[PDB]
């Protein structure tokens, strides 16, 4: 079950636009549509590999410049090395290889546009609900609990393990109007609150 006493936007200062601008400026980036990943870096569970492949696919496109990526998690030295390499290659990629407190995570969810949950294995998907409670729009693998939580009114579902499909979904998400973004956020919070 989700703790909506902790996971809500009451704890956050100012507006979403303000927070996102400040956040990105700390990473040396100007404003852009911001996608975040938070999870273990492994080969077949959380899907960081799928995300990194998707970033590589997108990087040859002009629209890539309008995207910002925040990639948080730890694990394999090879996977961390890969994430770090992309960070050095692309000025719109930030990688943070460590655990952050739930307070920090909460602030981040309330300060990005989308949270990417490219899981292969996700029995509970409590992460989707937490992100949704804070107005972050999920782009997620259609697996386990994520299937139950995420709807067409609240986010984007993709086939697990498919970097191409993910890249397509990210481009689709980038193109959404502010009005559509706003409706998604409203539905996200409503749905997350309904999970009580």
* Burial zone of 120 (CB within 10 Å; 0-12 exposed, 13-18 middle, 19+ buried): middle
* Burial zone of 25 (CB within 10 Å; 0-12 exposed, 13-18 middle, 19+ buried): exposed
- Please compute, for residue 42, the number of CA atoms within 13 A of its CA located in the half-sphere on the CB side: 9
Do residues 133 and 8 lie in contact, with contact meaning Cβ atoms separated by under 8 Å?
yes
Residues 6+ apart with CB under 8 A from 23: 34, 108, 111, 112
Count CB-CB contacts under 10 A for residue 147.
14
The structure was resolved to a resolution in Å of 1.8
Please give the structure tokens belonging to residue 60. Answer: 């040859």
Which domains, and CATH codes, for the chain?
Answer: 8-196 (3.40.50.2000)
Do residues 139 and 115 lie in contact, with contact meaning Cβ atoms separated by under 8 Å?
yes
Torsion of CA 177, 137, 36, 150, to 10 degrees: -140
């Amino acid at each position: 079950g989700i703790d909506c006493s902790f996971w809500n936007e009451s704890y956050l200062t100012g507006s979403r636009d303000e927070r996102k601008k400040s956040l990105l400026s700390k990473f040396g980036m100007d404003e852009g549509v911001t996608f975040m990943f938070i999870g273990r870096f492994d080969r077949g569970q959380k899907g960081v590999d799928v995300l990194l492949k998707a970033i590589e696919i997108l990087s040859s496109k002009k629209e890539f410049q309008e995207m910002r990526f925040i990639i948080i998690g730890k694990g394999d030295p090879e996977l961390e090395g890969w994430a770090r390499s992309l960070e050095e290659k692309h000025g719109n990629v930030k990688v943070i290889t460590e655990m952050l407190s739930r307070e920090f995570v909460r602030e981040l969810y309330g300060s990005v546009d989308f949270v990417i949950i490219p899981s292969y294995f996700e029995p509970f998907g409590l992460v989707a609900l937490e992100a949704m409670c804070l107005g972050a729009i999920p782009i997620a693998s259609a697996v386990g609990g994520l299937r139950d939580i995420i709807t067409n009114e609240t986010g984007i579902l993709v086939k697990a393990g498919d970097p191409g499909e993910l890249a397509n979904a990210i481009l689709k998400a980038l193109e959404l109007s502010r009005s559509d973004l706003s409706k998604f956020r409203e539905n996200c919070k409503k749905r997350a609150m309904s999970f009580s």
